[PDB]
């Protein structure tokens, strides 16, 4: 039934943004309401998305899914019957080149800055002692353009890190950290590392048990004429799949 509600959307730094919407408002409607509330230009809306996440005790975010066009975010979150789930606004492109468009606007730039800062703070981005010194300086100095330009050069800038999970490559039940970005999946074995190029994935599938446990399996071209299925077991399997699809999509738009 259509009725007006207040919705909390969090930014990357935990600042809360409250918007008035209808229960029957869809994802795009809510997104537009948030953007309106923040004074974000219309022409940047396509650069950001809303995500459903679970907040853990330590305040870190486990990404659950990107909200799709047909969804009703209020329903989406309330129907889960858990206060741990939050809607988050975050940049939704992969090529850091698009940062150029976003940084032309002050509010866009603030959003990108906030999420980059949080990415470093949560250890998603890997830096050296000197870089850490500089970064920590700009933070105080708040130039932000320069801060972002520096951040763009950092390892795994623009990547999404997932909660520790397991995979069956190279061995069964191996503990792994998965990260998605720059058209690949990075697997850190927490140390040896693997890179699974999206263009080398013939397909992927999200599976669930029955007599919970979610898996993402992709059929990977390991070498010439040799395909091998790789399976990652993770509660964020769907988010990983969404990311694979999203990266492929971005590649299609770019290719065209």
């Amino acid at each position: 039934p259509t009725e007006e509600v207040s919705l909390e959307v969090l930014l990357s730094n935990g600042q809360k943004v409250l918007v008035n919407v209808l229960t029957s408002d869809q994802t795009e409607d809510v997104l537009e309401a948030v953007a309106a509330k923040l004074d974000l230009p219309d022409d940047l809306i396509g650069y950001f998305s809303l995500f459903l996440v679970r907040e853990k005790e330590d305040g870190a975010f486990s990404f659950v899914r990107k909200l799709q066009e047909f969804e009703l975010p209020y329903v989406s979150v309330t129907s889960l019957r858990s206060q741990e789930y939050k809607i988050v606004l975050r940049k939704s492109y992969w090529d850091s080149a698009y940062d150029d468009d976003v940084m032309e606007n002050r509010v866009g730039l603030n959003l990108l800055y906030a999420q980059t800062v949080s990415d470093i703070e949560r250890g998603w981005i890997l830096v050296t002692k000197e870089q850490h010194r500089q970064l920590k300086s700009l933070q105080e100095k708040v130039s932000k353009k320069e801060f972002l330009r520096l951040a763009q050069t950092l390892r795994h800038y623009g990547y999404l890190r997932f909660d520790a999970c397991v995979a069956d490559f190279p061995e069964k039940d191996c503990p792994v950290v998965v990260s998605a970005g720059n058209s690949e999946l990075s697997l850190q074995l927490r140390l040896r590392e693997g890179s699974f190029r999206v263009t080398r994935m013939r397909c992927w599938r999200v599976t669930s048990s029955v007599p919970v446990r979610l898996e993402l399996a992709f059929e990977y071209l390991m070498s010439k004429d040799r395909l091998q299925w790789v399976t990652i077991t993770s509660p964020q399997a769907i988010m990983m799949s969404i990311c694979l699809q999203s990266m492929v999509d971005e590649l299609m738009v770019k290719k065209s």
């Binding site: 999206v198 080398r200 013939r202 397909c203 992927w204 059929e219 299609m252």
Partner: peptide, 10 residues
Amino acid sequence: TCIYNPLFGS
């Protein structure tokens, strides 16, 4: 079942 990746092989 498994959705084919349109970019696969290139």
